[PDB]
RNA sequence: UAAUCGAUAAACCCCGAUAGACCUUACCAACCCUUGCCAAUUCAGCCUAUAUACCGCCAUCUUCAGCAAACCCUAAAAAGGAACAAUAGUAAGCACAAUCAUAGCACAUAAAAACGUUAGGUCAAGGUGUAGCUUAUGGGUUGGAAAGAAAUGGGCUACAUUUUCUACAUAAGAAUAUCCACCACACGAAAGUUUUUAUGAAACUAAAAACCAAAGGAGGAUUUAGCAGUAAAUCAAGAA
C-alpha cells in the first residue's frame, strides 16, 4: 500500500512513470552516443567520388547541409550520402554525356 | 444578441450552477480556467494536443460516470501528469465510485501514456448559485 | 487517430462501462423507424423492386 | 471514423508524404541545382514527376480535426473558428480570455 | 536519504537564470514569496524582478456564416518573473531547482539559463600548436 | 480544510459562496503544501545535500581572474507528455580576449577571422552552436571552435605578407 | 438567521487559529492585514474582478445587516410606528420633528457634507426612496437653521460626514550635486509613447543638450524649439538655465512635448512657491491625456466607418 | 466521430423543437452490456460465498434473457405512457364548465380547507 | 459555359474564405468499386429535400429601457394600477446602471446590452426531428472549369506646384505639358509586351527590372464618413 503522497511520488519514479527532476530535455535520448566530430566533419564520406569534379561542389553542399542538421541521427546522414553515391553510380551515361567524364 | 454559452432567463424558476451563471465575458473577471496547462503561453508548444486530450477527457469523464456528473470538469496539467478533479453527485454505491475510480486511472494512465490522478468530491446537490 | 477514439469508446460501450447518449439517442429513433416500417433496404433490394 | 471522407483523403495524404519524403527531398536537391549539369536535371525531372502526386507537400490541407472545416482553422490549436470560440467561451480554453483594451 | 562524496571538482554557476511564465499574476506573486523563501533558507543569495508582459490578441468572425461586420476578439497575456541568483555551486543549484521544479504550479512554465563557470580547455592554456 | 473560506462572485444577498462543492475554489491552484513552516522544515532537510562555495570567489575581478570563460546554457519545463524541447541544443561561449595569452598579430588575426562574433566594444568573443541534437555535442564543438580559433590566429602565412 | 452569526463567528475564530498555527503566526497579533496576505498566498487566484477573489472574513462585513424580530411571541409589535412599513424612517422622522418642536420652544464648508442616501439606508438598515432622503436632509437644514443646542449639535453630527480636498503639485526639494557643489532637479516627462528625463542645472550658460546633441540640431522643427521655450520664457530663466537632456520613444512632436512636461517639472525646484500655481493654469505640468485611439474591428479608423449603403 | 458526437440534452432540444421527450437514462445499469460481462463491482455484488469474484462473462441464452427484460421494459413504459389517459368531464367533453378543481390551498395561518 | 452552393432593403455586394493552379471541391466530363474507415450489427455511407421542424452560433431594432414570476386593489377585470405638502400599489429575478479591461487617477474607448421583433441569417462548421437515396442522391482515379457585350457595389492610384526627381530627415540641387522638330518630354502604367527571380512535382500565382507610356486636366442627378489625438495624410506588423 501506499503510506504517503510522497511514497506515490517516489514509486512512480523508480518505475519510471513520473519525471526526473530537474528537468533535463535530453533525458532519454543517448543520440547513439555520438559525438560533434561525428556529425560537423563529413570527409568520411566523401572519399569515394570524383575529387575536382561539380560533383564535389554538389555533396560539399550536401555536406554543408548535413552538418547543420539538428534534426537527424548519424545514420540517416550517412544514407542519404550513400544514396548520392548509388544515384551518380547508376548513371555514368549522363554524368559521360554532359562535357565532363566523371568516376 | 450573443448566443454564446448562455443560459436564458425563464419564468425564473430554473436551477443554475456558478459557472452556467457566468457568461463568456466574465472570464478571468470572475470565472475562472476550467483547464490548465502551459500550452498557450507565448513561447510554448503543443497546445493543440492538451486540447484535443481535454476535449476527450471531457466527452470520457461524462460516459464512464452517467448522471452522476455535477458541474464541468476540472483539468490540471502539472509535470506530465494530470489532475482531473470532479465534482461528483451523489447517486452511486461507493462501492461502484471505487470500481471506477481505478477504472478510469488505469485506462486513461494507458491511453495518454502519462499518469493520471483523479479526485472525486462528491455532493449532495447540485450546487444552486442562481434562481430556485 | 480517430478510428481509435471511435472503436475504444465504442467497445468501452459494450463492455458496459462507458455510455453513449448519442448512440442511443441513435439507436432508440433507428428502432422507432424500423418500427413503423420504414428501415434501411436489404442491399440490392430496395431498387429494382 | 475520421469525421468526414475528405478528413481520411487528407489523412492518407499525410501517410503518404512522411512515406516519400526523403526521396522528393533528394530528388529535388540535384533538380534545384544550378552547379550540376542540365542532363541530370532533367531526367531528375521526370523522377520526381514519376512518384505518386498524393505524395506530393502542397496537395496537403490542414482543416479543423474536431470538425473537419477546411477553411477558418487557427494554426496553433488546429480548429476551426466556430469549434475554437466554443470551447473557449466555456473556459474550457486555458489562458483564452475575452480581449478588451 | 543517502549522500555520496565523489573526489571530482563540482561545477560552479556565476548566474542562475530562472524565467517563470504565467497566466494569473497571483501565482506568479505566491510562487516568487516562495522561491525567495526556500532560497533564503538555502543562503543561495537571490534577486527577483519583472518583466515587461505580453499580450496576444486576435480575432475571429462572431457568427456561423455571414457578418463580417461583427468579429470576437481574444486574448493571451503572458506575465513574469525572473529569479537571478548568483555565486551557486553544481550541487546547490540541483537541489534548490529540483525543489522549485516539484513544486510548479500547473499553469505556469520555467525557463532555465545557467552560466557556468569554466577557466581554459586543455589544449589552449599555454601551448602554441 | 478546517480554514472556512468563501469564494465566488455573491449574488445581492451578498453572500460570496460557501466553501463546499465551490468549483472556482477547486480550479485555484494551491500553494496550501508550501505554507512557510513546511518551507523551512523542507530547505533544513535540503541543507545537507548542498555543497559550500569558494571563499574568494565574491568579486566579479577574482572570476575573471580566474576563470575567464562563461558557457551559456538553458533548460525549459512545461506541463505535458513529451520532455523534449527543441531550444535546449543551444549553447554559448563568452570569453573575454583580454584574458587571452594572443600575440599582437594573433589577436588581430583573431578579430578579422571571427567577426561580428567578437564585441569590440566589451571584448567579448561570443560562440553559440546549434548544430548537434544534444547540449554535451554543443559544448564539445564550441570548445572546438575555440581551440581552434586559437591555434589558427598563430599562424602566418603567405597571403598574409601579401 | 442569527443562528447563523454565532455559528459562523465561532467556526471564524477557530478557522483563525487554524490560520495561524500552519502560517505560523501569534494568534494574537494576526490581524485582517496578516488574514488577506495569508489566504492570498495559499490560493492565488489572478482575477480581475475582486469581489470574485477568495476572502475569510469576520461574517458581519461578509453578511448583509439583517431587520431583527419585529414582534413579540404574542403578536403584538414592539414599535409604535410598525404599521407605516418604514418605521426606521419615520422614527427619524418623529425624532428629528421632535427636536425641532422643542428647540422651537425652548428658543422662544469645512469640507462637511449630509449623508447620501446609500448611507442612510445603511445607518437605518432600510432600504429608501429618494423623495424620502430629500425630505429628511430638508428637515436637517430646517434643524441648522435655528438656533443650536448641545444634543441638537450632537443629533445633526450623526448625520454629518467630511470630505478631503488636496490640491498643490508636489514640490521636490532640490538636490546639490557634490562633484560642483552645485544644485540641480531632475525632471520626467512623459507623453503619447514618449517618454523624457530633464535634469536642469540652476547655474546655466543658457546651454540646452538633448541626447548628448544641442536642442538646435535635435529639433530642426522651429515649432519644438518654441515649445521647449514655453516654460523659461514663462518664468524668464532663459538664459539662467543648463539643461541635460534624455528623451525616446514616438516622434519629433511628441519628443518637444515630453521634454516640455519634465522640463516644466524640473523647473519648479528653482521657482517661486506662487509661480506653480501659474505654471499649472497655464497648463504646463499636467501630462496630455490625449493618445491614438485603438481601430475597432469592422470599422476603418477607429472611428471612420466602412462606407455605408442604403440600398 | 466519437469526437462528431453531443450531450444527450442538447439532441433532446434539437428534437423537441421548442424555439415528446423519453429519456435513455431509465432502464440501464452500470456495467450493462450487450457483449454481457459481469463486472465485480456493477453487475454483482463484490464477494459471493468465497471472495473476490473475478471478471465473468454470462451465456448466449443469459443474455438472451435480460435483453428480452429491457425489451419487456421499454414496451411497459411505452403502455404507461399511453394509459395516462383518463379524466371525468364537467358538463361536455372539453368545457371546463363544472370540473372539479380540487379543495383551495391551505392560507399562511396554517388554515385549512 | 458540359460545369458548385450560400448571402442579396436598412440587417447583400474584398460576404461564409484570416483566402480555389493540383489539393481544397461540394461542380461537369469520362472511367472504375459494391457490408464500401469502425469492435459488432438486413449494416455502413449521402455537402440530397426541409433554416417555415431545430440545437448551435449571429444579424436587427439597441446604448432601447424595459421584461417577469408572487401577491394586492378596481359598484368588474378586454385591461388598468401614478401624483411626494402623494390619491392603491408591494415584489426578490433578468436588463440598464455599478464594478471589471485598456496596468495608478479621472474621462474616453472597449465590453456588455434582457424580453421580445424580422417564420431575419445559416440542414455546406458540427449536430440533429421528418422525409427521401442504398450495383447509388454512396466511395474512388483522371482531366476540366472560374470566358466578357455589358451593368453596377466597394476599393487603389492619379489628374500634378501644398507638385515630380536625387540626396536626405523635415533650410538643399535640378525637373516643371509648351516650346518646337524636341534627338520629345512635365504629372499619370497600378494596365500590357519581354526577361529574370520567389514558391511549387505542375505556373496559370506573386515580386523585380527593361520597355511603353494610355485614359485622366478635379467628375451629372445624388450621395458616404468624421466632434480630437478624431478626420485626413504617412509607415510598419500579424493572421491564414
Ligand atoms: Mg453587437
Ligand atoms: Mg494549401
Ligand atoms: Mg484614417
Ligand atoms: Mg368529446
Ligand atoms: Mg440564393
Ligand atoms: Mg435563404
Ligand atoms: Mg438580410
Ligand atoms: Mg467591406
Ligand atoms: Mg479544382
Ligand atoms: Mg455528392
Ligand atoms: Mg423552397
Ligand atoms: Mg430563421
Ligand atoms: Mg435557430
Ligand atoms: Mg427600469
Ligand atoms: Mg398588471
Ligand atoms: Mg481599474
Ligand atoms: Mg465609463
Ligand atoms: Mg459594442
Ligand atoms: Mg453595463
Ligand atoms: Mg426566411
Ligand atoms: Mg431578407
Ligand atoms: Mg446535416
Ligand atoms: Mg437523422
Ligand atoms: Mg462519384
Ligand atoms: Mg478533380
Ligand atoms: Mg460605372
Ligand atoms: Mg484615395
Ligand atoms: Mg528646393
Ligand atoms: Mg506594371
Ligand atoms: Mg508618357
Ligand atoms: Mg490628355
Ligand atoms: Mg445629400
Ligand atoms: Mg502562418
Keep these: 500500500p501506499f503510506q504517503n503522497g510522497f511514497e506515490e511520488m517516489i ?67 550517412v544514407e542519404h550520402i550513400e544514396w548520392f553515391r548509388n544515384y551518380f553510380n547508376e548513371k555514368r551515361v549522363i554524368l559521360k554525356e554532359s562535357g565532363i567524364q566523371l568516376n | 444578441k450573443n448566443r454564446a454559452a448562455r443560459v436564458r432567463v425563464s419564468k425564473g424558476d ?48 461524462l460516459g464512464t460516470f452517467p448522471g452522476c456528473l455535477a458541474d464541468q470538469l476540472v483539468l490540471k496539467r502539472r509535470a506530465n501528469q494530470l489532475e482531473i478533479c470532479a465534482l461528483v453527485l451523489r447517486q452511486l454505491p461507493p462501492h461502484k465510485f471505487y470500481f471506477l475510480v481505478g477504472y478510469s486511472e488505469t485506462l486513461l494512465s494507458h491511453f495518454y501514456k502519462c499518469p493520471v490522478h483523479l479526485h472525486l468530491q462528491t455532493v449532495p446537490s447540485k450546487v444552486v448559485y442562481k434562481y430556485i | 487517430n480517430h478510428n481509435t477514439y471511435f472503436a475504444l469508446m465504442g467497445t468501452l460501450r459494450f463492455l458496459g462501462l462507458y455510455r453513449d447518449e448519442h448512440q442511443d439517442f441513435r439507436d432508440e429513433q433507428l428502432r422507432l423507424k424500423k418500427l413503423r416500417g420504414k428501415g434501411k433496404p436489404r442491399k440490392g433490394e430496395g431498387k429494382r423492386a | 471514423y475520421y469525421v468526414d471522407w475528405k478528413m481520411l483523403r487528407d489523412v492518407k495524404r499525410r501517410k503518404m508524404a512522411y512515406e516519400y519524403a526523403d526521396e522528393r527531398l533528394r530528388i529535388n536537391s540535384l533538380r534545384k541545382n544550378t552547379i550540376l549539369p542540365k542532363d541530370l536535371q532533367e531526367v531528375a525531372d521526370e523522377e520526381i514527376a514519376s512518384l505518386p502526386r498524393d505524395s506530393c507537400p502542397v496537395r496537403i490541407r490542414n482543416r479543423c480535426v474536431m470538425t473537419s472545416r477546411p477553411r477558418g482553422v487557427k494554426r496553433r490549436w488546429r480548429l476551426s473558428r466556430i469549434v475554437f470560440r466554443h470551447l473557449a467561451d466555456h473556459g474550457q480554453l486555458s489562458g483564452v480570455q475575452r480581449a478588451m483594451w | 536519504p543517502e549522500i555520496t562524496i ?113 577557466q581554459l580547455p586543455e589544449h589552449i592554456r599555454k601551448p602554441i600548436w | 480544510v478546517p480554514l472556512p473560506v468563501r469564494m465566488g462572485y455573491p449574488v445581492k444577498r451578498g453572500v460570496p459562496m460557501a466553501k463546499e462543492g465551490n468549483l472556482e475554489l477547486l480550479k485555484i491552484p494551491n500553494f496550501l503544501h508550501l505554507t512557510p513552516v513546511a518551507i523551512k522544515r ?28 562563461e558557457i551559456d546554457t538553458a533548460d525549459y519545463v512545461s506541463a505535458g507528455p513529451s520532455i523534449r524541447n527543441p531550444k535546449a541544443r543551444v549553447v554559448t561561449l563568452r570569453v573575454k580576449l583580454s584574458s587571452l595569452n594572443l600575440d599582437d598579430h594573433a589577436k588581430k588575426k583573431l578579430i578579422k577571422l571571427v567577426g561580428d562574433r567578437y564585441c569590440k566594444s566589451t571584448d567579448v568573443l561570443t560562440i553559440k552552436t546549434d548544430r548537434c ?18 591555434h589558427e590566429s598563430w599562424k602566418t602565412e603567405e597571403w598574409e605578407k601579401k | 438567521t442569527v443562528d447563523f452569526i454565532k455559528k459562523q463567528i465561532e467556526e471564524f475564530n477557530i478557522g483563525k487559529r487554524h490560520l495561524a498555527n500552519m502560517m505560523g503566526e501569534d494568534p494574537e497579533t494576526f490581524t485582517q492585514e496578516d488574514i488577506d496576505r495569508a489566504i492570498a498566498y495559499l490560493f492565488p487566484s489572478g482575477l480581475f474582478e475582486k469581489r470574485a477573489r477568495p476572502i475569510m472574513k469576520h461574517p458581519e462585513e461578509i453578511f448583509p445587516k439583517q431587520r431583527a424580530i419585529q414582534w413579540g ?44 442616501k446609500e448611507e442612510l439606508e445603511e445607518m437605518l438598515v432600510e432600504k429608501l426612496s429618494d423623495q424620502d432622503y430629500a425630505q429628511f436632509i430638508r428637515l436637517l437644514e430646517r434643524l441648522s437653521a435655528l438656533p443650536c443646542g448641545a444634543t441638537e449639535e450632537d443629533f445633526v453630527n450623526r448625520f454629518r460626514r467630511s470630505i478631503p480636498x488636496x490640491x498643490x503639485x508636489x514640490x521636490x526639494x532640490x538636490x546639490x550635486x557634490x562633484x560642483x557643489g552645485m544644485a540641480f532637479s531632475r525632471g520626467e516627462g512623459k507623453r503619447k509613447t514618449a517618454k523624457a528625463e530633464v535634469v536642469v542645472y540652476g547655474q546655466g550658460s543658457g546651454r540646452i543638450d538633448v541626447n548628448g546633441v544641442d536642442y538646435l540640431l535635435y529639433f530642426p522643427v522651429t515649432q519644438d524649439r518654441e515649445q521647449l521655450m514655453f516654460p523659461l520664457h514663462f518664468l524668464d530663466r532663459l538664459g539662467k538655465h543648463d539643461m541635460t537632456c534624455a528623451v525616446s520613444g514616438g516622434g519629433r512632436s511628441a519628443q518637444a512635448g515630453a521634454v516640455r512636461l519634465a522640463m516644466a517639472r524640473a523647473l519648479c525646484s528653482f521657482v517661486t512657491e506662487d509661480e506653480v500655481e501659474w505654471m499649472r493654469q497655464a497648463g504646463l505640468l499636467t501630462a496630455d491625456p490625449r493618445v491614438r485611439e485603438r481601430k475597432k474591428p469592422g470599422q476603418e479608423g477607429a472611428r471612420r466607418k466602412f462606407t455605408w449603403k442604403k440600398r | ?20 421527450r423519453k429519456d435513455l437514462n431509465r432502464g440501464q445499469i452500470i456495467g450493462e452490456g450487450r457483449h454481457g460481462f459481469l463486472w465485480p463491482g456493477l453487475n454483482i455484488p463484490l464477494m459471493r460465498n468465497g471472495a473476490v469474484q473475478t471478471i465473468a462473462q454470462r451465456s448466449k441464452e443469459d443474455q438472451e434473457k435480460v435483453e428480452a427484460d429491457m425489451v419487456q421494459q421499454r414496451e411497459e413504459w411505452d403502455r404507461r405512457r399511453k394509459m395516462k389517459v383518463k379524466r371525468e368531464r364537467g358538463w361536455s367533453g372539453n368545457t371546463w364548465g363544472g370540473v372539479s378543481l380540487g379543495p383551495p390551498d391551505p392560507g399562511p395561518n396554517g388554515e385549512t380547507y
Excluded at chain 5, 77 to 106: F, K, M, W
Aim: net charge negative.
Design chain 2, 14 to 61: 430554473k436551477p443554475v450552477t456558478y459557472e452556467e451563471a457566468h457568461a463568456p465575458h466574465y472570464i478571468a473577471h470572475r470565472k475562472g480556467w476550467l483547464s490548465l496547462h502551459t500550452g498557450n503561453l507565448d513561447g510554448e508548444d503543443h497546445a493543440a494536443e492538451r486540447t484535443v486530450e481535454d476535449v476527450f477527457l471531457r466527452k470520457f469523464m
Design chain 5, 6 to 118: 565523489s573526489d571530482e571538482p563540482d561545477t560552479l554557476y556565476k548566474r542562475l537564470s530562472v524565467l517563470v511564465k504565467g497566466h494569473d499574476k497571483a501565482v506568479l506573486d505566491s510562487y516568487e514569496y516562495f522561491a525567495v523563501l526556500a532560497a533564503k533558507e538555502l543562503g543561495i543569495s537571490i534577486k527577483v524582478h519583472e518583466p515587461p508582459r505580453k499580450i496576444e490578441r486576435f480575432t475571429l468572425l462572431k457568427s456561423v456564416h455571414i457578418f463580417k461586420k461583427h468579429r470576437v476578439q481574444y486574448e493571451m497575456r503572458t506575465l513574469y518573473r525572473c529569479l537571478e541568483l548568483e555565486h551557486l555551486t553544481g550541487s546547490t543549484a540541483d537541489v534548490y531547482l529540483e525543489y522549485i521544479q516539484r513544486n510548479l504550479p500547473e499553469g505556469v512554465a520555467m525557463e532555465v539559463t545557467k552560466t557556468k563557470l569554466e
Design chain 1, 11 to 77: 514509486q512512480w519514479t523508480k518505475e519510471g512513470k513520473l519525471w526526473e527532476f530537474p528537468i533535463n530535455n535530453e533525458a532519454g535520448f543517448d543520440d547513439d552516443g555520438s559525438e560533434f566530430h561525428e556529425h560537423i566533419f563529413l570527409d568520411k564520406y566523401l572519399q569515394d567520388f570524383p575529387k575536382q569534379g561539380p560533383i564535389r561542389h554538389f555533396m560539399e553542399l550536401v555536406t554543408c547541409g548535413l552538418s547543420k542538421n539538428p534534426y537527424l541521427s548519424v545514420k540517416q546522414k
Design chain 7, 73 to 116: 411571541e404574542d403578536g403584538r409589535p414592539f414599535h409604535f410606528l410598525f404599521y407605516t412599513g418604514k418605521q426606521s424612517y419615520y422614527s427619524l422622522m418623529h425624532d428629528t420633528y421632535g427636536k425641532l418642536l422643542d428647540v422651537e420652544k425652548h428658543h422662544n464648508p469645512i469640507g462637511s457634507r449630509w449623508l447620501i
Design chain 6, 42 to 69: 523542507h530547505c533544513e532537510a535540503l541543507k545537507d545535500f548542498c555543497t559550500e562555495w569558494p571563499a574568494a570567489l565574491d568579486s566579479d575581478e577574482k572570476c575573471e581572474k580566474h576563470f575567464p570563460i
Design chain 8, 1 to 20: 466521430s466519437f469526437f462528431t458526437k453531443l450531450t444527450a440534452d442538447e439532441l433532446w432540444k434539437g428534437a423537441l423543437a421548442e424555439s415528446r
Design chain 6, 133 to 150: 541534437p544534444l547540449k554535451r555535442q554543443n559544448y564539445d564543438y564550441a570548445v572546438y571552435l575555440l581551440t581552434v580559433l586559437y
